[PDB]
Ligand binder design. Structure first.
Ligand SMILES: CO[C@H]1/C=C/O[C@@]2(C)Oc3c(C)c(O)c4c(O)c(c(/C=N/N5CCN(C)CC5)c(O)c4c3C2=O)NC(=O)/C(C)=C\C=C\[C@H](C)[C@H](O)[C@@H](C)[C@@H](O)[C@@H](C)[C@H](OC(C)=O)[C@@H]1C
Ligand SMILES: Cc1cc2nc3c(=O)[nH]c(=O)nc-3n(C[C@H](O)[C@H](O)[C@H](O)COP(=O)(O)OP(=O)(O)OC[C@H]3O[C@@H](n4cnc5c(N)ncnc54)[C@H](O)[C@@H]3O)c2cc1C
Ligand SMILES: [Cl-]
Ligand SMILES: [Cl-]
Ligand SMILES: [Cl-]
Ligand SMILES: [Cl-]
Length: 474
């Protein structure tokens, strides 16, 4: 038997898979696809995920196989400027194909001692009070204390629990594909930049592979939800929205995605959880899809490992739903807003012209970039300091950076005084004493995910909030 079984080998499960191994947890990653899809779906990590990959040391290998981007135009394609006061030390956008992201997270989680069987497909599941049982299409039953569903929008775990997927259906179809075109490099760059003024969900991305990532709107609503668009369909759209089919020489793949904004009603059913697209689907606008799943897994693994190790507080697991569900709503909302700001109708365009006036304000631009990147995500932890709930940025200390002490996923107590000490939580929380000109407060208590639950200077006050998130002393 296992401690935790995850269902899904995407970036969400493999992040959860490694976040458990840090604490020694028997994890099994069940993945249906035998060969990982080369269909580059996403295109990179935003600021918070980059922060996340640094708190665990995986950032060096992400920058080797991607490149940084510091340009504006993420909110509804309102081309702007990258802000200059982002409250972070990783003020850029990383451009890594999801295939490489899946690869590095798997190679890391594998190297952390995590079974990942591919070709296994969960067909049924049921749970008692002592664990959860899992039936596969081949016939193997599996036992685990906790099962988490990280298996995409059409999640099988979600449907086997009765968790509803309420929201708005897909009403704006859009076509996408990686293909060559019979046109001069200048020919694309002069037409795209020209027509974009009216249609804002249209453009071309060369990724070096000689071929181009081209997205073009679609007419109507596809009923099949599984019918690949013919090249002729793809060509007619380019002509109807840009005037020239560009002559596609050949497609490597053609996809058709919608704008459905659904979100699971419950993130937890006793011993079964949901994370990633399995708990929330939404339009790709803003690049928050993959970043949302990584940070859901980054919210749960240390809580799930806190329970299997038998030191988690009472309602720790219940907060996974109570902290990550409001994030998906707000993200599902602005995607609804960004899609609206791209509508061709006279109304939406008028509101687009209005936002175009507002993003000229430095604080307004900073406010939206802080929202797409989710660096201003704040949990309700408890009354107190202005820092409670928010994540701590990479503070430059006397010796080294802050995100260098957080690799082993342990709770951190950054002290500037030397008169603090945890007694009875050494087994879970570390004690880092270092100076930082960036932290006006004397001390900060960080959860394994960087979110502050206490910031101050009194120890008797610290002795209150230590057990509420780290358990009773030894
Ligand atoms: C071709 O896509 C266009 C419109 C799609 O319309 C529409 C409805 O369908 C989309 C698809 C299919 C996406 O995959 C997408 C995406 O990954 C994304 C962001 C949101 N921003 C998006 O909105 C979208 C998006 C839409 O909103 N992800 C990112 O930005 C991240 C984390 C890294 C990407 C870095 C590349 C190398 C460039 O630096 C970026 C910054 C520019 O290339 C973009 C502005 C896009 O390219 C151009 C030429 O303008 C533009 C979104
Ligand atoms: C056109 C398009 C463009 C996108 N662009 C971006 C972007 O620019 N930036 C961004 O951040 N996000 C983007 N996304 C979203 C991104 O693809 C997802 O958010 C990302 O995959 C989330 O991680 P995941 O592991 O939960 O998803 P998934 O890849 O769907 O993980 C599901 C895995 O579990 C497997 N599985 C399914 N059922 C079972 C079962 N019963 N048993 C075992 N295994 C099962 C699946 O086969 C799959 O391998 C885009 C999506 C689309 C469709
Ligand atoms: Cl490693
Ligand atoms: Cl469902
Ligand atoms: Cl006008
Ligand atoms: Cl202005």
């Amino acid at each position: 038997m296992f401690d935790v079984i995850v269902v899904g080998g995407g970036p969400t499960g493999l992040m959860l898979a490694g976040e458990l191994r840090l604490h020694g947890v028997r994890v099994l990653v069940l993945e249906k696809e035998t060969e990982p899809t080369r269909q580059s779906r996403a295109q990179g990590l935003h600021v918070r995920s980059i922060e996340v990959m640094a708190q665990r040391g995986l950032l060096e290998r992400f920058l080797e196989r991607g490149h940084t981007v510091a340009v504006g135009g993420f909110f509804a394609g309102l081309a702007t400027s990258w802000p200059e006061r982002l409250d972070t030390a990783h003020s850029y956008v990383l451009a890594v194909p999801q295939v490489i992201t899946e690869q590095l997270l798997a190679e890391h989680a594998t190297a952390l001692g995590a079974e990942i069987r591919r070709g296994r497909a969960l067909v049924g599941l049921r749970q008692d009070e002592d664990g959860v049982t899992v039936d596969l299409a081949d016939g193997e039953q599996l036992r685990a204390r906790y099962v988490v569903g990280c298996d995409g929008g059409r999640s099988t775990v979600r449907k086997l629990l009765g968790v509803a997927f309420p929201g708005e259906p897909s009403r704006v179809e859009t076509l996408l594909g990686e293909m060559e075109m019979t046109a001069s490099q200048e020919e694309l760059t002069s037409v795209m930049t020209e027509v974009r003024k009216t249609q804002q969900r249209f453009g071309a991305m060369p990724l070096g592979d000689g071929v181009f990532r081209v997205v073009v709107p679609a007419e109507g609503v596809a009923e099949d939800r599984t019918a690949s668009p013919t090249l002729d369909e793809f060509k007619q759209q380019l002509r109807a929205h840009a005037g020239t089919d560009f002559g596609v020489h050949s497609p490597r793949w053609l996809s058709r995605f919608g704008d459905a904004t659904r979100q699971a009603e419950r993130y937890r059913v006793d011993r079964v959880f949901l994370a990633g697209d399995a708990a929330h689907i939404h339009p790709p606008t803003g690049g928050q899809g993959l970043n949302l799943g990584i940070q859901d897994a980054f919210n749960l693994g240390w809580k799930l490992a806190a329970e299997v190790d038998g030191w988690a507080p009472e309602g720790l697991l219940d907060t996974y739903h109570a902290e990550r569900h409001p994030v998906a709503t707000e993200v599902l909302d602005n995607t609804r807003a960004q899609i609206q700001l791209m509508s061709t109708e006279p109304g939406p365009q008028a509101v687009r012209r209005l936002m175009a006036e507002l993003v000229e304000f430095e604080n307004v631009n900073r406010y939206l970039i802080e929202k797409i990147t989710a660096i201003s995500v704040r949990y309700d932890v408890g009354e107190g300091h202005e820092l409670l709930g928010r994540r701590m940025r990479d503070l430059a200390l006397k010796h080294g950076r802050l995100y260098e002490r957080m690799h082993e996923g342990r709770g951190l107590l950054l002290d500037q005084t030397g008169r603090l000490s945890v007694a009875g939580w050494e087994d879970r929380v570390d004690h880092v004493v270092e100076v930082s000109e960036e932290l006006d407060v004397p001390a900060v208590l960080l959860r394994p995910d960087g979110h502050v639950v206490w910031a101050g200077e009194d120890q008797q006050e610290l002795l209150t909030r230590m057990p509420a998130w780290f358990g009773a002393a030894t």
